[PDB]
Amino acid sequence: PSSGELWGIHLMPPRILVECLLPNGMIVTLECLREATLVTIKHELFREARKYPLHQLLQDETSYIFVSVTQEAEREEFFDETRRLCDLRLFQPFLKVIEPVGNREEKILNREIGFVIGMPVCEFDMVKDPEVQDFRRNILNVCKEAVDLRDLNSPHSRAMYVYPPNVESSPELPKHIYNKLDKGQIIVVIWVIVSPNNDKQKYTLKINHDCVPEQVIAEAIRKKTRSMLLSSEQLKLCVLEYQGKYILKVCGCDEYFLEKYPLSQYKYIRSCIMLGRMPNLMLMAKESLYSQLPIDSFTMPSYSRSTKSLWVINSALRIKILCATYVNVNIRDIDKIYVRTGIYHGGEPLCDNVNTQRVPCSNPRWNEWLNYDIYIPDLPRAARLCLSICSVCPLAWGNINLFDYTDTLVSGKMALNLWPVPHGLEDLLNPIGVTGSNPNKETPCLELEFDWFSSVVKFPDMSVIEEHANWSVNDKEQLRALCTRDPLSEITEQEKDFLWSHRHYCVTIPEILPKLLLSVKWNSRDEVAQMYCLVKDWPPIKPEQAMELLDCNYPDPMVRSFAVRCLEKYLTDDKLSQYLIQLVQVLKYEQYLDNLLVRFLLKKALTNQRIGHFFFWHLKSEMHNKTVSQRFGLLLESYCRACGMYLKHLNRQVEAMEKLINLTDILKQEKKDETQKVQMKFLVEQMRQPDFMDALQGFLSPLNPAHQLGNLRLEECRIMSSAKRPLWLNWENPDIMSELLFQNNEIIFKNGDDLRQDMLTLQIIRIMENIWQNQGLDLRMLPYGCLSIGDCVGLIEVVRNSHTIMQIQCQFNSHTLHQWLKDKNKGEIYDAAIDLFTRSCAGYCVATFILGIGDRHNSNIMVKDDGQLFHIDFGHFLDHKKKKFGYKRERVPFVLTQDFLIVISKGAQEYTKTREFERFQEMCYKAYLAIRQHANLFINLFSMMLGSGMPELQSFDDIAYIRKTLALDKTEQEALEYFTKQMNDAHHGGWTTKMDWIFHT
Amino acid sequence: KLHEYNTQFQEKSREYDRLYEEYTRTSQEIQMKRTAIEAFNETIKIFEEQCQTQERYSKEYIEKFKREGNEKEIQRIMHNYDKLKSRISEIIDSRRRLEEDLKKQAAEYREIDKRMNSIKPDLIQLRKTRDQYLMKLNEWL
Ligand SMILES: Cc1cc([C@H](C)Nc2ccccc2)c2oc(N3CCOCC3)cc(=O)c2c1
């Protein structure tokens, strides 16, 4: 829990006194520059150590190392002497000098895992509990299995873990993209550097889009060779033996084509195709890529060192609520308290109960056995107790797994530190909340006693259950219209009974599993056992419909096993990276640290470091948060051991962001609340200091590691008005082919704002674009990249040449927007630039409508010169405003429709009833109805995110808004009517031409 | 009268937000400071250990000088012990002052919990008090 250079001081002085404690037993106050390296300090100290007493009995400086107290309070031994004083994150400025005993300099130099990770590794060592310790150890078995895979075939397997192919999955082109080619083939410029001047020789090529890079190389070979005259048989030998001695790189960024994919299938190219720009690749020596990718180098660490069945028990479940510790409200203003309990499986099984309203608020005691009406053998595996200490309101809540990670039923006494209730939760008990004791010990602590039986009770294993499963063992055909249905729709008791009734019949419509599973009395025993038998050998289903089964409503290990088995069979490295945001937040619902999902994700992170990169950052994002701080800690550690050398590069960037975080913390809080002028000479002068130039120059971009952030431009770096104090930063692209793709890497860094909503919305946006694309609509969105690196810290990708509509429209005239875009796209390029606007607009319109993006405006929307518009700064998300009022309230109509319709119908005086408007209006209909048929994918993606403390997604009724935006009970036409009626609806976010809302006259 | 309960609703509601923002903002400074308390304890622990190394390695030298009547050199050795224990006094004065801010936060935090719970149920009523008036006429706002 900390920030900057020293405890309480955000930024060290240009020089500080640092107390050096020598081993001769004496204190040597030393004058230091904040920049100074530890190697240079030691050296300077040791000259000054001669002028103090006992100077002879000290040894040579190289027989010594420094130690101090870090800002997270622990003895850090500074073995790496590169480091600088400011970067040391010291508590107080003082240094102890010791002999560097306690060896493995190498292993003790993985207190960088503890820095990059967010929690120091020492803390995991000093942890009780077996599960945590069991996890750290056994998870290393997943890590070997990774390193071994990525090292068999050592040259190529390596350059495939770093730099995996960016392939779009399914070679098959949509035929509307294919026609943009020309005779089913595409032009391609292949560049090559040569010995002297870095002479960039180009070689252009027409080639079949579907051919593999191997072949593109060969076509290159022909062009260069066959200028000189030679046989057909010669060329064919020259290819044979040198075809594969080269590789292809995209010009501008570290993204290679190292795989036998159709050249169109690579994202770079297919992007070039539909976008209508010409791909520029670089031909590189295969040997020179391989030579500069190091050793894998994984070594393991220090941490490598009379029961019953459940079904024997013949009694109801009972639980003694013993007594609390304390609770914070005043006796007078309301004084009745009772602990409300209830056992759960996600949604309630046993008909739950309260406890006696005895309200000694002074000393909350009860000592009453609560007797629930469930038989102990009927209890499913995922059974868990939920509770809260309520008032005559919730107050403080908590949850408990009724079984250990070992499968043991809990017994006897135990305490449970309770959590506080979230902001917008009123509902007494909390079952979708995290399961365990509050790590915060300074909180309400409620005590329990479960029963102890003769000996330690254990849940049965598969084989024994299958014995019991066997022991127990048309217009009906068209109630598969049950599985053609949104997953938060609910199903009546007949529908549950019907589904269950015909379960054997069900296996041939595999889609219905989430509804069949939802129709099982989990409080059964016999039913669950028959089910466990079906799900064992259930036929696999599509990645998307299976990852529903990994959300919070399917908490059974058997169920989830089947979800993960689906995932590892299907679900490409493409679509895995796509949905990675969602799968990391869905771990939150898994009872025990070591589960098949955590395994699958970790292997993939260590198989493909593009996944690894985001898998890391997505986990570090939630590391301030104590709910998952433990779980994500131990997982993130295990990524950091097995990742090879990317830990050098993750470190480089986590140190970079930390410098920004702490710099902007000065501009916010500290005596830096005044003019742009004062803050810009401060910031720009601070950025010139060495510690700073090194932290933020020469590293990779967290938004995308492909682009290298080179030198700071610095003269381009600036600050926004907003009292968040966001930074606009400009780096060079230090590539030799800089000038071909991006020579400006510009990024928005940001404190204060929870970027997480933007991060999700921009994901949804992309998926909609894919649905529309593959459906043959060409509505072009701009899902610019944006990563949350932490607690209201983020990064946002800057689109070049964009402007906000405000800037562009500043008497005022509605035509103004159009009569500018005309000016930027003169004459011949005009009809094309308006097409872009009209399609762009249509998409963003239908998109923001569906998701209900928060009240939008003038600087929310942007337009590029070429005419593509795009929305930014989504923040408050799907309705949500409804919480502030608590009613279907009237809101500002989208006033910009005027400006936009003029650009849509070209300078038309009248534009509401045009040939042009019909064409746009159509597009919006097409795109809206298109998403409807893919509706469920969206409902699932949002419900996986329930875990995250996003304020807009803290319940299911929140998601239910997307049912209202789509057609819920409505059929295509009815739904097209709802849409249009809500679009032409003034004072409901829409538009008419009254041109006198506000006053009415 | 909705105009009547909208005045109660917005006052209780928007005070809960000033109240809930002081809750989690204080809560951070609580654990923040407490882990600074921890760092103090390792610093006072290391400064005591340095202090114990003077009194070790000093014994034979300090006597040797007393014998030779050096004084001028004895006074340099003690001058350094004088700094040493003086700076550990400051660490402790600094620890104690942070120790109270922590206790003070302990008090004022619990009071934000107290009154935060006090606001909850009385806001729960005011909201569905407003249901009574669902009886065009959207203007009593
Ligand atoms: C508060 C704020 C401000 C901006 C403006 C356009 N950029 C800006 C940021 C920092 C300092 C100066 C300007 C923003 O611009 C962006 N854009 C920048 C252009 O490309 C797309 C993303 C996203 C925002 O979320 C965003 C948010």
Ligand SMILES: Cc1cc([C@H](C)Nc2ccccc2)c2oc(N3CCOCC3)cc(=O)c2c1
């Ligand atoms: C050119 C144009 C026109 C509309 C009009 C108001 N909506 C509409 C679209 C198709 C048929 C009927 C109305 C628009 O409506 C919107 N709204 C649609 C409702 O949610 C908020 C955004 C956004 C636009 O960018 C937008 C742009």
